[PDB]
From Swiss-Prot, chains A, B:
PROSITE patterns: HTH_TETR_1 (PS01081), HTH_TETR_2 (PS50977)
Keyword Transcription regulation in annotation: yes
Gene name of the record: tetR
Span of domain HTH tetR-type: 2-62
UniProt keywords, alphabetically: Antibiotic resistance, DNA-binding, Magnesium, Metal-binding, Plasmid, Repressor, Transcription, Transcription regulation
Assembly notes: Homodimer.
Glycosyltransferase keyword on record: no
Superkingdom as given in the UniProt entry: Bacteria
Pfam families, alphabetized: TetR_C_1 (PF02909), TetR_N (PF00440)
Binding-site residues, tetracycline: H63, A81
Protein name (Swiss-Prot/TrEMBL): Tetracycline repressor protein class D
Molecular function GO labels: DNA-binding transcription factor activity; metal ion binding; transcription cis-regulatory region binding
Length: 198, 198
């Protein structure tokens, strides 16, 4: 088949969905593209390079709320960017595992830069802007990984038998959205406090 | 060597530290214990069973702040339990990945039960108690996974070149502790609000 970057990534994401991250190999990708493994190697050197590229492409294709809108509040921005990040990770099988394994791109750096500038323009120190973005990112990756890795591996007390029911309710969105508001409000409280004991 | 449960788990955790989760195999474990693979199988059927057991043992050995102290506030409890959970995951290589792959034990259920009862005794609804515990857990697993998976794979803008410096500062503790306070304060605000628009 055609072996330009875009076509290779397309095939690899389709494979990812069929196999999961642990099952994804260059040998299967070559089979999927109708080529010998040495032909693939010219284009993609190893699994690591493949996954690095997938991780970037997934956000490039699907994380379309990475930047604030004209006039958006920083609360609203973090909320929107978290939801979008979440959706993008969930779009592919083991997507969050794919994401975790990566160090960031230059574009992601331009984008992260604009995000930190935005935060600091809104009254955050560099540190606190970064801490906030990091905590959203951690909380989001954590929740998706649990949603996703719940599937990988496949008699209860009053509250817990039922904790499990409350959860086997939707995909994880309610709990996710609820903790997200709690986090943002926490940041609010912090930012508003300035040097006052809080 | 001796092949009681405890000895097998000990050897397996030591192997985990030498190999990481992806590198851990029953064949290496058997070599480490001085036995043939069919002998090991009697004791541990596969990698999956092995990892399930490790995940439980790691928290049993090292997550020693899983329950509130006499008279402890729920804020203080979540803070302490988060720090402890964090430390336990960090104690072994790929520890958070080990943890993620698991569904919980019966003991973890007794323990989680007591935690949800504690939360509800303090004024949380079941839902909100669960949402809070989940968000702490997600945020913590997220942060540790990034700390840890930062290692697995091994020119910057004013703020970001420096975002990276702020981070390459400690292990992740500062950012973690800071987001943890933000989360707890968010829960506080929520709980205190009752039915008032907040
Ligand atoms: Cl073609
Ligand atoms: Cl081509
Ligand atoms: Cl012996
Ligand atoms: Cl024995």
């Amino acid at each position: 088949s055609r072996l330009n970057r875009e076509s290779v990534i397309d095939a690899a994401l389709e494979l990812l969905n069929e196999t999961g991250i642990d099952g994804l190999t260059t040998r299967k990708l070559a089979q999927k593209l109708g080529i010998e493994q040495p032909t693939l190697y010219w284009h993609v050197k190893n699994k690591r390079a493949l996954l690095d590229a997938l991780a970037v492409e997934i956000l490039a294709r699907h994380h379309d709320y990475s930047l604030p809108a004209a006039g958006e509040s920083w609360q609203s921005f973090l909320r929107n960017a978290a939801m979008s990040f979440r959706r993008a990770l969930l779009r592919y099988r083991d997507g969050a595992k794919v994401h975790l394994g990566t160090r960031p791109d230059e574009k992601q750096y331009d984008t992260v830069e604009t995000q930190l500038r935005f935060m600091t323009e809104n009254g955050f120190s560099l540190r606190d802007g970064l801490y906030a973005i990091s905590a959203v990112s951690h909380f989001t990756l954590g929740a998706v990984l649990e949603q996703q890795e719940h599937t990988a591996a496949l008699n209860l007390p009053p509250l817990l038998r039922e904790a499990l029911q409350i959860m086997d309710s939707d995909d994880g969105e309610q709990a996710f959205l609820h903790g997200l508001e709690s986090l943002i409000r926490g940041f609010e409280v912090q930012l508003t406090a300035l040097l006052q004991i809080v």
